[PDB]
Amino acid sequence: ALWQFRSMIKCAIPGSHPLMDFNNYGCYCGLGGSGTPVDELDRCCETHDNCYRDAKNLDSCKFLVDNPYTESYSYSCSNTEITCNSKNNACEAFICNCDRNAAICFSKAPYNKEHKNLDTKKYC
């Protein structure tokens, strides 16, 4: 679920303020997107979006409101390391991994303040 994804981010990046730092960044770190990502971080976000898209297109999965962010799963944090519980069902596991890969991707991507709250209408 969305709240768990923000927690995953705090896990991989202790000092982070998920909502404030990674929302409304570049072209894809936020709701939907357009154009091409402006940098690694922005691409991490595009990949997360694409991952959610692949999940919605799974015949075997049906998310409430057709929004994967509503799908709650089980995961655990241990010293910056994120672990998706093997007991999550196939759909939950898929979402858990999308979030986990995104959280990790965020922790290794440069954070360019100039790309924060970017004028998407022009540069995306």
Q: Which residues are identified as catalytic?
A: 48, 99
Q: Indicate which of Cl ion, Ca ion, a copy of itself, none lies near residue 49 (CB less than 5 to 8 Å, by partner kind).
A: Ca ion
Q: Annotation-wise, does 39 bind a ligand?
A: no
For Cl ion, which is the closer residue by CB, 7 or 23?
23
Task: Determine, following the binding rule CB under 5 A, whether residue 49 of this chain makes contact with Ca ion.
Answer: yes
Residues engaged in binding Cl ion (CB under 5 A): 18, 23
10 Å CB burial of residue 54 (0-12, 13-18, 19+) is exposed
Return the structure tokens found at 62.
């049906």
Q: Which residues have C-beta within 8 Å of that of residue 4, sequence separation ≥ 6?
A: 72, 73, 75, 99
Q: Annotation-wise, does 119 bind a ligand?
A: no
| Sequence letter at residue 26 | G
For a copy of itself, which is the closer residue by CB, 55 or 109?
55
Return the structure tokens found at 55.
């999940």
Of the candidates 81, 12, 89, the residue with the CA atom closest to the CA atom of residue 44 = 12
For a copy of itself, which is the closer residue by CB, 4 or 23?
4
* Binding site residue list for Ca(2+): 28, 30, 32, 49
Binding site for Ca ion (CB under 5 A): 28, 33, 49, 72, 92
